[PDB]
Amino acid sequence: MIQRTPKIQVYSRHPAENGKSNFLNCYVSGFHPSDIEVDLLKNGERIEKVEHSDLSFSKDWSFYLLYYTEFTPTEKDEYACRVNHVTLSQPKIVKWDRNM
Q: Domain residues of the chain, as ranges?
């Protein structure tokens, strides 16, 4: 058996073909086993509509998830990624740095 804690990155991107749109991304990387729970949060509340959830693996024991959706941030709103995994005794919450 092998288990690996995910690395978690939270960041925003504008698609270059449509630069006015903005996407909030979580990249949850290098984890094993593949069982996982991942949410985007807005002011502590789970975002129910997340448009994209893309899972892949490299080696048979390394999984990668890109979880992202369109959003319109304002400076009053706080966003975060919340991940649960067997390697994490408590849910891990990674705040979005608004300059990233």
A: 1-100
Rounded CA gap, 11 and 34, in Å? 22
Helix (H, G, I), strand (E, B) or coil at 7: strand
- CA dist., res. 23 & res. 71, Å (int): 6
**Token match 């740095």: residue?**
97
| Experimental approach taken | X-ray
Place of tokens 């400076």: 75
- 76 with 18: CB under 8 angstroms? no
Q: Are 22 and 12 in contact (CB under 8 A)?
A: yes
* Burial class of residue 35 (count of CB atoms within 10 Å of its CB; 0-12, 13-18, 19+): exposed
Looking at CATH, the fold of the domain delimited by 1-100 is given as Immunoglobulin-like (2.60.40)
In a 3-state reduction of DSSP, which class is residue 81? strand
Query: In whole angstroms, how far apart are CA 75 and each of 22, 63, 78, 97, 99?
Result: 14, 33, 8, 11, 11
